[PDB]
């Protein structure tokens, strides 16, 4: 099992960066929860948080936000 664990971290730019992708997803989820909790404690921040967030994002994404 040791050998297995090392290759996921150790073998660069393979089909082994599985755990890496999963963790990225995990980071995103926890971060998202931080945003949710943070806004609940501080709901006033929402509007301004977006403007900062929106300063670069795709034009297509701009369309999706206005339609929805």
């Amino acid at each position: 099992l040791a050998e297995w664990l090392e290759k996921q971290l150790t073998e660069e730019d393979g089909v082994h960066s599985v755990i890496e992708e999963n963790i990225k997803c995990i980071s995103r989820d926890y971060v998202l929860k931080q945003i949710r909790s943070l806004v609940q404690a501080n709901p006033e921040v929402a509007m301004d948080s977006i403007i900062h967030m929106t300063q670069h994002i795709s034009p297509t994404q701009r369309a999706e936000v206005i339609r929805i």
Binding site: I51, H52, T54, Q55
Partner: protein, 78 residues
């Protein structure tokens, strides 16, 4: 009688120039220029840099005054 007119114009110049986020710049330029001496350069290079790139970064979508930053610098060498 002119007051009821006069204040209306006056009030728009205030509010309008108060929304204009070039105010902190114009007052921090003008004040930090007029107390330019008696000056410790750590605090001068800090103030003069950051007034300058409040000026550069004005008209950004996400521009707020770096209050905590200036205060903190003052805070540590205080």
């Amino acid at each position: 009688p002119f007051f009821s007119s006069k204040v209306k114009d006056w009030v728009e110049r205030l509010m309008k120039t108060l929304r204009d986020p070039s105010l902190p710049l114009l007052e921090l330029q003008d004040i930090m220029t007029s107390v330019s001496g008696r000056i410790p350069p750590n605090v001068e290079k800090s103030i003069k840099k950051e007034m300058a790139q409040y000026a550069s970064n004005i008209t950004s979508v996400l521009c707020q005054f770096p209050s905590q930053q200036i205060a903190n610098i003052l805070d540590s060498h205080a």
